Specification:
Cathepsin D, subunit A, domain 1; mainly beta; globular; 24 strands; protease; 4 helices; aspartic-type endopeptidase activity; signal; 2 domains; 330 residues; six-stranded mixed beta barrel
């Protein structure tokens, strides 16, 4: 089997992407944030504290003939940005782009933090990292991908994110029409539960490639590209008027600036992030100062190849016995 679903930016900055997912019987369609940096599938629901719901579509288990409470199970997660959610757990039938998993853990939010409430466009998350990060207790549950794997034609999914435009998540096959040239595959470590890999270096603009190992995670659920302070300083030094602002919370630059591209290495291959992808627009409405899409990972504890990086590529998440990551230009 295979599945194929379109993913759409939630706003004009590509802050996140939402993908329609069918839950229950008859189907309840919710728009989820597919997150390769976490491993919980959780939804706004009929159980979510009423005051914490503001425009989201909710899952109502009591209207699904295939829903079953996982009695005694609870979940609680915190994300890198400090947001959080928690609740109890159902199993139900979940379909993504035609691909159906029966008995999927669907984690029903009883509580969500302000950032989730405030985002009316996101009905929940679908985690695609490794199931070892799943937060269900007492017994950890498997991700959609994990559950689907034995059914898939090939044990893969692919992320093809759009710049200011829709893209695609495919399960079980590689669409050889969605990229140019070849896919370069690189080793993954699952030790921390992430799609963790090592880039071979970077270049700024038309500068020479610097060969240096950068360990990081492929994370569709993070907006920006977070890299070591040395790397990030080298980039912004090439932008007239750019500086790091503690009050804004990162590198800023004059909105009129022309930004250089940023190249990262995948083995002996290269992925080029165009300058425009690195412009995340005014720091506040009407400002002539703009926020950078490449920021320092210092203080995060991990480098993160988030949407800014991933949308410049066709990305293969290979969940074979020995997992790998593949990157193609497109």
């Amino acid at each position: 089997s295979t599945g194929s679903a379109t993913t759409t930016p939630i706003d004009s900055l590509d802050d996140a992407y939402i993908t329609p997912v069918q839950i229950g019987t008859p189907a309840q369609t919710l728009n989820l944030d597919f997150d390769t940096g976490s491993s919980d599938l959780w939804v706004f629901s009929s159980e979510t504290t009423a005051s914490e719901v503001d425009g989201q579509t909710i899952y109502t288990p009591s209207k699904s003939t295939t829903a079953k409470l996982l009695s005694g199970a609870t979940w609680s997660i915190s994300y890198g940005d400090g947001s959080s959610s928690s609740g109890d757990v159902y199993t139900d039938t979940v379909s993504v782009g035609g691909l159906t998993v029966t008995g999927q853990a669907v984690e029903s939010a009883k509580k969500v933090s302000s950032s989730f409430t405030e985002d009316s466009t996101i009905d929940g998350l679908l985690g695609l990292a490794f199931s070892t990060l799943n937060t269900v207790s007492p017994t950890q549950q498997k991700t959609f991908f994990d559950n689907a794997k034995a059914s898939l034609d090939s044990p893969v999914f692919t992320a093809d994110l759009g710049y200011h435009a829709p893209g695609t998540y495919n399960f079980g096959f590689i669409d050889t029409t969605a990229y140019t040239g070849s896919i370069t595959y690189t080793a993954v470590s699952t030790k921390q539960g992430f799609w963790e890999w090592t880039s071979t270096g970077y270049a700024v603009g038309s500068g020479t490639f610097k060969s240096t190992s950068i360990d990081g995670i492929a994370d569709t659920g993070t907006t920006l590209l977070y890299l070591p302070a040395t790397v990030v300083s080298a980039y912004w030094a090439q932008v007239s008027g750019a500086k790091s602002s503690s009050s804004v919370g990162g590198y800023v630059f004059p909105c009129s600036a022309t930004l250089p591209s940023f190249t990262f290495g995948v083995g002996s291959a290269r992925i080029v992030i165009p300058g425009d992808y690195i412009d995340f627009g005014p720091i506040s409405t009407g400002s002539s100062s703009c926020f950078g899409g490449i920021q320092s990972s210092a203080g995060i504890g991990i480098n993160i190849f988030g949407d800014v990086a991933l949308k410049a590529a066709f990305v293969v998440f290979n969940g074979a016995t020995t997992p790998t990551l593949g990157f193609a230009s497109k």
